[PDB]
């Protein structure tokens, strides 16, 4: 008794969304809310930074929206296995925006469940080598031959 009936596949931009989003009324329809609605996206935009993200509303009829993504297209999520997490009072040593070859992969799995992929390389450059684009790296993928 529960079907997604709409996954606003759309896009938002990180501090600068407002009650007048592309959508406002295309989406008005879990019950009519707006403000939810950027308040948690400019709460987390704010929270972060500014920025563009694909939102992808998965809506079910019964009224009810579920759906978070953080940062532009893969970031949306590779954010987080990247290396988001500032800390405190720590020995030093570290770095932000660093994801690992399995990370990239399962992200990049699902990713490539029968679209044209089909090689783990390909989806994974994608999602791994997408993050380089965003200047994000691997954390690992080891590869030698010297025993």
């Known amino acids: 008794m529960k ?11 990180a501090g600068k969304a407002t009650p007048a989003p592309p959508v406002g009324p295309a989406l ?5 809310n707006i403000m939810e609605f950027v308040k948690a996206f ?4 704010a929270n972060m930074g500014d920025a563009i993200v694909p939102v992808e509303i998965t809506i079910y009829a019964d009224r009810s929206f579920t759906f978070v993504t953080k940062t532009p297209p893969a970031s949306y999520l590779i ?3 990247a290396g988001l997490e500032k800390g405190a009072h720590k020995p030093g040593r570290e770095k932000v925006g ?4 399995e990370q990239v992969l399962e ?3 699902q990713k490539m469940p029968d679209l044209n992929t089909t090689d783990l390389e390909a989806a994974a450059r994608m999602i791994a080598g ?9 954390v690992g993928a080891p590869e030698v031959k010297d025993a």
């Open 3 to 13: 079907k997604v009936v709409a996954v606003v596949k759309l896009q938002l931009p």
């Open 28 to 32: 008005g329809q879990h019950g009519a």
């Open 42 to 45: 400019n709460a987390a935009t």
């Open 79 to 81: 954010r987080k296995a």
């Open 98 to 101: 660093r994801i690992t070859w």
């Open 107 to 109: 992200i990049a799995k």
């Open 130 to 138: 997408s993050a380089r684009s965003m200047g994000v790296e691997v």
